């Protein structure tokens, strides 16, 4: 049995102004895998949403999504998670807080792939966001000034650069109907140090 | 009308009331401790206010009500008011992490990480008025 | 605590260098007395070539021991299963790890190289990116070249193979380049070694800083 | 000099001798099993040789000595010789992947995955001559 506690996305923290932290526990006998929520302060916590689903491999996955305060998270409050199970010997504890350290604004660069044989009605858009600290970043894709769904793109895990910064890559496949409607695709990046108003974006075009 | 009446364990100065707490607490945990005592973290807007605080503040280091939303980058007090009077230390406000503000034993202001554990904090609330 | 991982050989070492090697990595989070002991055995029962044991104590206080076993080119490709038994004295169960050739459909990789423009404060240095996509299985070797000679592996960073929206896999490569590098020769080749790549397991694309 | 003498449990045909093994083995494990018996996996170069094999082969399915180094793309026998004679099944050689060759009960050849576990394999070696 393993437990993981996440931090909120900079988009939910800085743009949406409604941050949420999720505690994921990957187990499955008597699945009464209780998830206790507590602050380092001892102050009460807002209502958490429990989501339990049984995977195809035969394992029970239960996620508890707790809502947190924007000012409370940014200011450095520590949120703890106690995981209990009947067959488990000792109670698992996970704690998360704001990554307090140096800051660096991200460098966004968008690219378009040329026509590949057998792939005419579809093209691939790539974007490199680099030299930012801490590792927490929100990568989004836009078309016709409106945001595209999260399932449409794939963003890499934050890896360290040769210097001090971090790097993330984003891949988005685009249909012929999309570029013919409007030949502009925006790559938005939401980051703690990004200026002005946590937004750094770059536009890209399929054959300009 | 005169504003001078203040609660137990708190010290009076001008139209405000001040509490000087002792104990290991982060900037955020000091802010919650201020609210629990029906007040908020100290806000300095005059050199007279600062002079009173230096006489009662901890020689080690104390937490104040100065911070930034990260979205702004500009230092704005807990009550909401902007910075009119500045008593920063030589070099401060630093841009090392490009943070929160703490008051030294000397009285000067310096930037410090939010997760830093200090043994002192200052609370402040409006002093209750007395009938004419 | 303890964990064991058994790797597959890189397509460059398997197809180009013609000398493949499989590594068994065991991360001991609580080092103790004695030694771990890494046994090597084939599914056939045939003997194994001599393995190189490499034990290093990390800065966090954990002992990392790697056993690199040499394997046969024809033996690996044809589907031989290589097993690794790990037996610590402070362990109840013996950890067993086994690796063999990923037998399934094949797809040739699609290579696309890109160059980043000049960013304020970054003049004497630029970043080169490469997208190698739609290939199966996940095993791929990504290399960077300058002046027809290969660049060191520490100079670049290649992402873990992630599945595409279709059937293939995708990998990204990042390489930082100095001013002296593009001024001597303004051409950077991104090589990709893959099982299905044709001809002779090589698919590459050239890139230039301001052409 | 006549070439017809062959070992115990092996069957004679032309200038070669053949062994028909029974047991669950992968293509690679069948190749090692043939080397252990001082031979190699069967190599077919004439329609006469194929006809003899069909009469003694397993009805379920048997492994043969045809494969590709993957680096090549074309099929090459275990001994090293190229394909001159080909008895492929309808639609074979299949390009489902882009692999190893097995012999059916009918005698036709079909592409199969190397990790597939078959209960039969055929070994082959040169027949010893008599004074
Ligand atoms: C049966 O199949 C299921 C999938 O269907 C497998 O479950 C997966 O298990 C892995 C490993 O336990 C899980 O990976 C972990 O995900 C954590 C969360 O990632 C996202 O969480 C939310 C999304 O809801 C986002 O807000 C967040 O930003 C993330 O995108 C990570 O935090 C974990 O990483 C931790 O460890 C790594 C080192 O390994 C550290 O570098 C990290 O810092 C961190 O501490 C981890 O990656 C995965 O999420 C599970 N999938 C699902 C769908 O739940 C089962 O494992 C599989 N069973 C078997 C036996 O294989
Ligand atoms: C103390 O610090 C050390 C580092 O100094 C940490 O050690 C690292 O631990 C991690 C996790 O145990 C190791 O990561 C694993 O690497 C395996 C191999 O990767 C490469 O191996 C060779 C390189 O020699 C290449 O041939 C090969 O192609 C790889 O590039 C992976 O196979 C592992 O992946 C498996 O587990 C993950 C989950 O952890 C799954 O998501 C995967 O699907 C897969 O099953 C894994 O990534 C890392 O290599 C160790 N570093 C070193 C230098 O040895 C200690 O963990 C740290 N201690 C603590 C307490 O944190």
Numbering used by the authors:
A (entry chain A): 336 to 362, 365 to 545
B (entry chain E): 158 to 255, 258 to 291
C (entry chain B): 335 to 545
D (entry chain F): 158 to 255, 258 to 290
Recite the paper's sentences.
In the present study, we have identified a new crystal form of the derCD23–Fc∊3-4 complex in which different crystal-packing forces constrain the Fc domains. The crystal structure reveals a complex consisting of one derCD23 head domain bound symmetrically to each IgE heavy chain between domains C∊3 and C∊4, as observed in the first crystal form of derCD23–Fc∊3-4. The earlier structure crystallized in a primitive orthorhombic lattice (space group P212121) with three complexes in the asymmetric unit, whereas the structure presented here crystallized in a triclinic lattice (P1) with two complexes in the asymmetric unit that are consequently subject to a different set of crystal-packing contacts. No Ca2+ ions were observed, as in the earlier structure, although in the presence of additional CaCl2 one Ca2+ ion binds to each derCD23 head in the same orthorhombic form; the structure of this Ca2+-bound complex has also been reported. In the triclinic crystals, all of the C∊3 domains have a high number of (atom-pair) crystal contacts, ranging from 50 to 75 over the four chains, whereas in the orthorhombic crystals a lower number of C∊3 contacts ranging from 18 to 50 is found. The derCD23–Fc∊3-4 interface is dominated by the four salt bridges and four hydrogen bonds that were observed in the orthorhombic crystal structure described previously. However, one additional salt bridge and hydrogen bond, Arg440–Asp227, is observed in all four interfaces of the new triclinic crystal form and is not present in any of the six interfaces of the orthorhombic form. To form the hydrogen bond, the side chain of Arg440 adopts a new orientation with its guanidinium moiety about 1.1 Å closer to the side chain of Asp258 in CD23.
